[PDB]
Design the sequence.
């Protein structure tokens, strides 16, 4: 019970965290669509 | 027959898999919850009426399996 | 190994390694022929037992497998376990290891599965005899050393664990399931479990938590009380027993959402009560938060001893420690009834003695000023609040205030908040009232209102024993019909008394908070105050608050600010409970509107606290949903929508915060992160949403009590300079404050860079300035924690005003609220009968090693530091008492608790 108590909190939190970031990958790009999205296009063409 | 375009299904797909995933993660916490959860249901109601709490699910099946269209 | 016959007794053991001749041929034939020979078998049982013991040392799989192979068959094949009824039953002792040799020593998947079921049945039947207990015991305490038993004994123990767990999941239970084939209860396996528990408690630790929690009953825990209370001192010390207990509640703390959690922790409290230390008793009674448990420990010292003794002094100390003041009210008046001395006792329980000890620490901490010298415009307003923020707690800065020049140059809402900031100079102090009084009887109503806020802050350290209560002053102002005056009055009353729900305080606040028909924005304070009062103790979920919220929604929707504050007030009210809060979620949801849905997600957090992993996932599906519906279509509304979105974000963070505290401390590292991705996210979820999640993060950290405080606030801060809303910085600093000038060296530079560098609006500048001064207290005067400190699982009541303010866009009106920030921690000092104000020595430990706790009981090696130091924050929190070498014994164990040390010198 003394190992477990530690584990029970800390594991479940690393599993949630991981899952969170999968749904979230898409979500990064959503607050922009021409506010930053457009900026990215401009830099790239320069770079080739 | 009709032609169409659908591009809104990228949003439906994305949350379908999201809700699925969270349950798997919950697996460890959830065992500990179940024991405490049951007495709550026995006391109050099952889900919207008392009726039929004796099994976890007592009602299974499907209302149609029948389909052949034209012969 | 090789057979060498019967030449000597040594070589008899070697003979039976390959093929036994006294357990296999002879016995087998004997059982399958005559039944006069049952008498010969009975004598030969003892011989057979000895041969197992001698060959336990041998570990090789092959020479246990094959040797006992035909005995394993004989159970059903020849003996059939009923050819002589009693006789095979009592001869099941050698045959039970034979079965285990195919389970564990040899692994054949088909037989390993099948014979698990067989082992369970025969364990139950042979525990009727009580000899299955003795069978377990010879392997638990061992007789021989081999690798084998180290895997084997567990299997026997696991049979019991298996069935008991299964009865919850599958309702059918008993031996109807063929997964064990053994009955769940009945007087044949119940007596087996009790006896098993005894042996495994002494030598092990393994199966005791599985048995209690698998029954699922507090009854299991109450059986445990009996056995442990015998063990308390003669078998091993008090300390070993305490470490043995608190964990029943802790592994399985997080692991009890409300109805189970309370019932288990009741029993742990009782175990402590039974044992020698009442010090362990008080800590658990606070935890439960029930009035009833507090009274019993206080009574236990006070009532039986007629004489003053140690006993009256000790009672007063114990109740004093909670600065919620919930214990303070209850414990008072028993002292009056008994009447040995009123004067010492009443003062000592009250937070009045805490004012005096602060002077001793302050005598050391002195004063270093660093306050802004800026004047004119909004920069005047900024500087005058900043002075109060640097002089939080008891400080003397009288002369600066008495220079009324800068005071009068404040204007508008600035005047109200300027007077309020003066009050925080004399926070936790009786004197200071004089400065406030001057303004209160002159000029415009604005300064009158600000005086009342300051009275609130000052009255925090003195409101018990009927010595200048906040109630006394503030009652007159409530009567006066002006809205500004009355609203300010009831805000200050709530702060001062905190968690105390005294009759006069509560009952003043009882008919009111029920007018919202008239449209008044600053009547947020109506419910807000009452909510604050409720926290710290079990909640009635008051009918006054629930009614007025509904009525407000009916009347108005124009004042968006008003309804947003109201929603939060309900959720803060319900804190200090979770059992009852399941009910009220449904009650709120009965009346359905999209506006009402905003209230629901907040209240879900409190109900579901002490688990949140059904709660967590919910508060994430919500985040997705706005996007989801617009998203869906291609392949009045304004107020309702905005309330909807904002509520969820707040709720997500809040859920996480309560959850991380109570239960395992390791997971805290990740829980901050549930937010970093949450932020990246929201900063991602809507354009509008980004604004809300920034502000929430800072209070996530402060509430959650993150271990890491160097990296994460600073890194996040840089991104959020670009982003709008400078109120982000204020929320970060409340976490960063820590033990002052450890974390905060980096903080002052980091926050100061963005503020000094960029000026492009004096509005933006103001938020940044206030945040910087908050973070530091000169010469490590005090620390702020959200947590009680008495429990590190705990949560305060004075810090809830801090938690409230981060849900809204910054406003001048909000600045008045932000002056209040109470949440003080006292510095421990070794007390005497003459009330000595110096500590001798202490050990401080940055990191507990002990993996015999989460909390980590402070070890006994430590690093030694001098007298009269503040109780260090993170990276100093485990604190052990050094005093034992100088002939001193602590009466009050201190682990890094808030609680003042008390010693008895010999």
Sequence:
């Amino acid at each position: 019970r003394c190992k477990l108590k530690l584990l029970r909190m800390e594991r479940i939190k690393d599993h949630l965290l991981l899952e969170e970031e999968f749904v979230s990958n898409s979500e990064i790009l959503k607050p922009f669509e021409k506010k930053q999205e457009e900026e990215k296009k401009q830099l790239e063409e320069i770079r080739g | 027959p009709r032609m169409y375009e659908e591009a809104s299904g990228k949003e439906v797909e994305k949350v379908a898999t999201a809700v699925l995933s969270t349950t798997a993660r919950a697996k460890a916490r959830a065992k500990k919850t179940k024991k405490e959860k049951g007495p709550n249901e026995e006391e109050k109601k099952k889900e919207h009426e008392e009726k039929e709490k004796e099994r976890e699910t007592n009602k299974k099946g499907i209302k149609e399996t029948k389909e052949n269209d034209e012969e | 190994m090789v057979d060498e016959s019967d030449k000597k007794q040594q070589t008899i053991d070697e003979q039976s390694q390959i093929s036994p001749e006294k357990q296999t041929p002879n016995k087998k034939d004997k059982k399958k022929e005559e039944e006069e020979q049952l008498s010969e078998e009975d004598a030969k049982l003892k011989t057979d037992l000895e041969l197992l013991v001698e060959r336990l040392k041998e570990d090789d799989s092959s020479l246990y497998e094959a040797s006992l192979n035909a005995l394993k068959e004989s159970i059903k094949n020849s003996t059939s376990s009923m050819t002589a009824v009693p006789k095979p039953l009592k001869f099941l002792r050698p045959t039970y290891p034979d079965l285990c040799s195919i389970y564990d020593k040899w692994t054949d998947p088909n037989l390993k599965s099948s014979l698990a079921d067989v082992l369970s049945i025969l364990a139950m039947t042979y525990s009727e005899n009580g000899k299955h207990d003795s069978l377990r015991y010879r392997l638990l305490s061992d007789v021989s050393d081999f690798e084998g038993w180290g895997h084997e004994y567990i299997r026997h123990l696991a049979l019991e664990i298996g069935e008991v767990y299964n009865d919850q999941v599958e309702k059918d239970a008993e031996d109807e399931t063929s997964s064990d084939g053994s009955k769940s209860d009945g007087s044949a396996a119940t007596s087996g479990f009790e006896f098993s528990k005894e042996d495994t408690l002494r030598l092990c630790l393994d199966i005791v938590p599985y048995f209690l929690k698998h029954n699922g009953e507090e009854d299991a825990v109450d059986l445990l009380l009996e056995i442990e209370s015998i063990d308390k001192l003669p078998q091993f010390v008090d300390e070993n027993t305490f470490q043995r207990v608190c964990q029943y509640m802790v592994a399985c703390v997080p692991l009890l959402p409300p109805p189970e959690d309370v019932a288990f922790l009741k029993t742990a409290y009782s175990i402590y009560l039974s044992q020698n230390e009442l010090t362990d008793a008080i800590a658990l009674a606070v935890r439960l938060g029930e009035e009833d448990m507090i009274r019993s420990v206080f009574d236990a010292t006070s009532d039986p001893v007629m004489h003053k003794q140690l006993a009256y002094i000790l009672a007063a100390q114990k109740t004093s420690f909670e600065y919620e003041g919930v214990q303070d009210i209850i414990g008072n008046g028993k002292l009056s009834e008994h009447f040995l001395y009123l004067a010492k006792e009443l003062n000592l329980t009250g937070p009045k003695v805490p004012e005096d000890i602060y002077k001793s620490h302050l005598d050391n901490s002195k004063s270093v000023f660093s306050s802004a010298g800026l004047d004119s415009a909004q920069q005047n307003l900024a500087s005058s609040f900043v002075n109060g923020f640097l002089n939080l707690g008891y400080c003397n800065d009288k002369l600066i205030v008495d220079n009324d020049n800068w005071v009068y140059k404040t204007k508008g809402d600035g005047m109200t908040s300027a007077v309020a900031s003066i009050g925080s100079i004399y926070q936790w102090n009786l004197d200071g009232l004089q400065q406030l009084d001057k303004y209160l009887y002159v000029d415009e109503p604005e300064v009158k209102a600000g005086a009342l806020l300051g009275i609130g802050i000052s009255a925090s350290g003195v409101h018990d024993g009927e010595v200048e209560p906040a109630l006394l002053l503030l009652q007159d102002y409530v009567t006066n019909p002006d809205t500004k005056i009355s609203s300010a009055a009831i805000l200050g009353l709530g702060i001062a008394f905190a968690g105390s729900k005294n009759d006069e305080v509560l009952g003043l606040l009882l008919p009111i908070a029920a007018s919202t028909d008239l449209p008044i924005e600053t009547a947020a304070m109506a419910s807000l105050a009452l909510a604050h009062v409720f926290v710290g103790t079990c909640n009635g979920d008051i009918t006054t608050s629930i009614m007025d919220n509904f009525l407000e929604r009916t009347a108005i929707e124009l004042k968006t600010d008003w309804v947003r504050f109201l929603a939060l007030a309900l959720g803060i009210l319900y804190m200090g409970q979770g059992e009852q809060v399941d009910d009220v979620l449904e009650t709120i949801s009965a009346i359905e509107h999209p506006m009402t849905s905003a209230i629901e997600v907040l209240v879900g957090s409190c109900a579901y606290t002490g688990t949140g992993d059904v709660l967590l996932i919910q508060d994430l599906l919500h985040r997705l949903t706005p996007k989801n519906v617009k998203g869906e279509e291609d392949a009045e509304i304004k107020s309702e929508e905005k309330k909807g979105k904002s509520s969820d974000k707040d709720a997500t963070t809040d859920g996480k915060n309560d959850d991380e505290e109570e239960e395992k401390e390791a997971g805290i590292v990740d829980e901050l992160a549930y937010a970093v991705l949450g932020i990246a996210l929201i900063a991602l979820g809507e354009d509008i949403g980004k604004e809300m999640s920034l502000r929430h993060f800072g209070h996530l950290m402060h509430y959650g009590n993150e271990h890491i405080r160097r990296m994460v606030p600073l890194a996040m801060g840089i991104v959020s300079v670009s982003d709008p809303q400078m109120k982000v910085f204020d929320t970060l600093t409340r976490f960063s404050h820590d033990a002052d000038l450890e974390v905060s060296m980096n903080s002052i530079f980091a926050m100061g860079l963005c503020g000094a560098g960029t000026n492009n609006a004096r509005l933006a500048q103001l938020l940044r300035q206030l945040a910087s001064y908050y973070s530091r207290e000169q010469d490590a005067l005090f620390i702020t924690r959200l947590a009680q400190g008495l429990l590190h699982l705990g949560k305060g009541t004075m810090t809830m005003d801090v938690f409230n303010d981060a849900h809204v866009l910054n406003k001048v009106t909000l600045a008045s609220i932000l002056t209040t920030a109470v949440g003080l921690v006292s510095p421990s000092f070794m007390l005497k009968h003459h009330q000595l104000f110096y500590m001798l020595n202490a050990g401080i430990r940055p990191k507990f090693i002990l993996a015999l706790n989460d909390e980590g009981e402070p070890i006994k090696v430590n690093v030694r530091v001098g007298q009269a130091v503040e109780t260090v924050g993170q990276a100093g929190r485990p604190k052990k008492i050094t005093g034992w070498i100088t002939q001193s014994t602590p009466v009050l164990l201190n682990h890094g608790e808030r609680a003042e040390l008390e010693t008895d010198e010999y």
Q: What stands out?
A: Residues 39 and 45 of chain A are 11 Å apart (CA to CA).
